[PDB]
Scaffold this motif. Structure first.
Motif, mmCIF file in Angstrom:
data_model
loop_
_atom_site.group_PDB
_atom_site.id
_atom_site.type_symbol
_atom_site.label_atom_id
_atom_site.label_comp_id
_atom_site.label_asym_id
_atom_site.label_seq_id
_atom_site.Cartn_x
_atom_site.Cartn_y
_atom_site.Cartn_z
ATOM 1 N N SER A 67 0.258 47.860 15.470
ATOM 2 C CA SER A 67 1.294 48.779 15.657
ATOM 3 C C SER A 67 2.085 49.799 15.843
ATOM 4 O O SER A 67 2.635 51.211 15.775
ATOM 5 N N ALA A 68 2.980 49.015 17.161
ATOM 6 C CA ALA A 68 4.034 49.576 17.923
ATOM 7 C C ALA A 68 5.387 49.655 16.959
ATOM 8 O O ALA A 68 6.247 51.279 17.121
ATOM 9 N N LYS A 69 4.963 49.030 15.761
ATOM 10 C CA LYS A 69 6.329 48.965 15.053
ATOM 11 C C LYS A 69 5.560 50.576 14.194
ATOM 12 O O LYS A 69 7.274 51.438 13.577
ATOM 13 N N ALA A 70 5.349 51.179 14.079
ATOM 14 C CA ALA A 70 4.626 52.563 13.393
ATOM 15 C C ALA A 70 4.395 52.983 14.268
ATOM 16 O O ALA A 70 3.222 54.643 14.239
ATOM 17 N N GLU B 253 9.447 60.845 29.024
ATOM 18 C CA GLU B 253 9.078 59.885 28.237
ATOM 19 C C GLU B 253 8.699 60.719 26.745
ATOM 20 O O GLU B 253 7.275 61.470 27.219
ATOM 21 N N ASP B 254 8.469 60.176 25.616
ATOM 22 C CA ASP B 254 7.653 60.213 24.767
ATOM 23 C C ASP B 254 6.933 59.141 24.407
ATOM 24 O O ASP B 254 7.190 58.835 24.435
ATOM 25 N N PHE B 255 5.635 59.911 23.985
ATOM 26 C CA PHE B 255 4.492 58.873 23.442
ATOM 27 C C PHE B 255 4.984 58.235 22.671
ATOM 28 O O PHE B 255 5.350 56.942 22.795
ATOM 29 N N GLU B 256 5.688 58.478 21.378
ATOM 30 C CA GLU B 256 5.504 57.677 20.286
ATOM 31 C C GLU B 256 6.939 56.934 21.247
ATOM 32 O O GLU B 256 6.775 55.376 20.491
ATOM 33 N N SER B 257 8.316 56.727 22.062
ATOM 34 C CA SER B 257 8.594 55.839 22.048
ATOM 35 C C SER B 257 8.119 54.603 23.375
ATOM 36 O O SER B 257 8.479 53.616 23.536
ATOM 37 N N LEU B 258 6.836 55.141 24.167
ATOM 38 C CA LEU B 258 6.546 54.830 24.697
ATOM 39 C C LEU B 258 5.772 53.405 23.969
ATOM 40 O O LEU B 258 5.643 52.022 24.164
ATOM 41 N N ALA B 259 5.156 54.026 22.608
ATOM 42 C CA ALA B 259 4.541 53.430 22.465
ATOM 43 C C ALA B 259 5.510 51.886 21.535
ATOM 44 O O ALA B 259 4.877 50.805 21.511
ATOM 45 N N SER B 260 6.230 52.395 20.844
ATOM 46 C CA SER B 260 7.040 51.488 20.454
ATOM 47 C C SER B 260 8.052 50.528 21.149
ATOM 48 O O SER B 260 7.340 49.510 20.634
ATOM 49 N N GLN B 261 7.885 50.913 21.959
ATOM 50 C CA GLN B 261 8.365 49.725 23.101
ATOM 51 C C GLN B 261 7.979 48.868 24.065
ATOM 52 O O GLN B 261 8.423 48.095 24.280
ATOM 53 N N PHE B 262 6.041 49.945 24.030
ATOM 54 C CA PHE B 262 5.501 48.715 25.492
ATOM 55 C C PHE B 262 4.417 48.899 24.771
ATOM 56 O O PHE B 262 3.072 47.681 25.168
ATOM 57 N N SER B 263 3.095 49.321 23.418
ATOM 58 C CA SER B 263 2.431 49.089 23.168
ATOM 59 C C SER B 263 1.898 47.066 22.548
ATOM 60 O O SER B 263 3.012 46.640 21.905
ATOM 61 N N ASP B 264 0.957 47.027 23.263
ATOM 62 C CA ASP B 264 0.543 45.624 22.300
ATOM 63 C C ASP B 264 -0.077 45.591 21.383
ATOM 64 O O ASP B 264 -0.368 45.160 21.060
ATOM 65 N N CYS B 265 -0.139 46.618 20.938
ATOM 66 C CA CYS B 265 -0.900 46.457 19.176
ATOM 67 C C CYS B 265 1.108 46.677 18.335
ATOM 68 O O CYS B 265 2.148 46.918 18.603
ATOM 69 N N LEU C 64 -1.181 53.950 22.591
ATOM 70 C CA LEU C 64 -0.207 53.324 23.259
ATOM 71 C C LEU C 64 -1.265 52.200 24.191
ATOM 72 O O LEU C 64 -2.326 52.055 24.604
ATOM 73 N N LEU C 65 -1.384 50.268 23.360
ATOM 74 C CA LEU C 65 -1.995 49.692 24.207
ATOM 75 C C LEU C 65 -1.712 48.998 25.207
ATOM 76 O O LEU C 65 -0.509 48.736 24.769
ATOM 77 N N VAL C 66 -2.157 48.489 26.024
ATOM 78 C CA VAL C 66 -1.617 47.674 26.953
ATOM 79 C C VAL C 66 -2.746 46.443 27.013
ATOM 80 O O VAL C 66 -4.149 46.622 27.441
ATOM 81 N N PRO D 211 -5.815 37.866 23.796
ATOM 82 C CA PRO D 211 -4.721 37.923 25.170
ATOM 83 C C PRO D 211 -3.145 37.519 24.627
ATOM 84 O O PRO D 211 -2.825 36.665 25.127
ATOM 85 N N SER D 212 -3.257 38.377 23.427
ATOM 86 C CA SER D 212 -1.475 38.094 22.857
ATOM 87 C C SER D 212 -1.172 38.809 22.313
ATOM 88 O O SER D 212 -1.843 40.123 21.420
ATOM 89 N N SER D 213 0.198 39.238 21.979
ATOM 90 C CA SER D 213 0.684 40.684 21.040
ATOM 91 C C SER D 213 1.933 39.827 21.055
ATOM 92 O O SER D 213 2.254 39.105 20.910
ATOM 93 N N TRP D 214 2.579 41.018 20.017
ATOM 94 C CA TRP D 214 4.544 40.537 19.418
ATOM 95 C C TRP D 214 5.091 40.761 20.498
ATOM 96 O O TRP D 214 5.870 40.780 20.306
#
Ligand code: A1AYA
Ligand code: A1AYA
Length: 147
Positions: A99-102, A85-97, A44-46, A54-57
């Protein structure tokens, strides 16, 4: 004494000894349990305003400060550790990478492919372990070693 990167520390607020890993920034009460050609990790990237891009999806222009990014990371870590919260759920919702989609999965990789702090933390994690905040030029990462 302890696995790679681990050291003993003293809780300021409780006085109880804990264990801190200076490669992964993991911290835990319990004495740490303890290298492969490859590891598989999710993250999970912030990002913040000093990130390489300094841009992301999630945000065309990422304007938050590094300090604000770290507080977000800290809050995600707290919710993952509490089970809220689960790691996977937070990454899907809030990662600036992207790979959030995965669910944050980056797949498997060797040494020499990722940014060095990310690589070092990834390879110092045991399978199933999660890092603390890991800093790279991309931003601040929570890393989960899955394989
Ligand atoms: C073109 N952009 C989307 C597709 N790209 C991607 C997706 C999945 C796996 C690996 C990659 C590239 O390493 C990232 C860049
Ligand atoms: C540098 N990385 C390239 C490939 N990444 C990606 C993006 C979407 C889906 C899956 C993946 C990888 O598992 C983004 C970051």
């Amino acid at each position: 004494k302890l696995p790679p990167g681990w050291e003993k520390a003293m809780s300021r607020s409780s006085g109880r000894v804990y264990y801190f890993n200076h490669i992964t920034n993991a911290s835990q009460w319990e004495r740490p349990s303890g290298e492969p050609a490859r590891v598989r990790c999710s993250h999970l990237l912030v990002k913040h305003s000093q990130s390489r891009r300094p841009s992301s999806w999630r945000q065309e222009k990422i304007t938050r400060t590094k300090e604000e990014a770290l507080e977000l990371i800290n809050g995600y870590i707290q919710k993952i550790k509490s089970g809220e919260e689960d790691f996977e759920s937070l990454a899907s919702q809030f990662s600036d990478c992207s790979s959030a989609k995965a669910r944050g999965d980056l797949g498997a990789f060797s040494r020499g492919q990722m940014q060095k702090p990310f690589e070092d933390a990834s390879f110092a994690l045991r399978t199933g372990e999660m890092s603390g905040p890991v800093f790279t030029d991309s931003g601040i990462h929570i890393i989960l070693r899955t394989e």
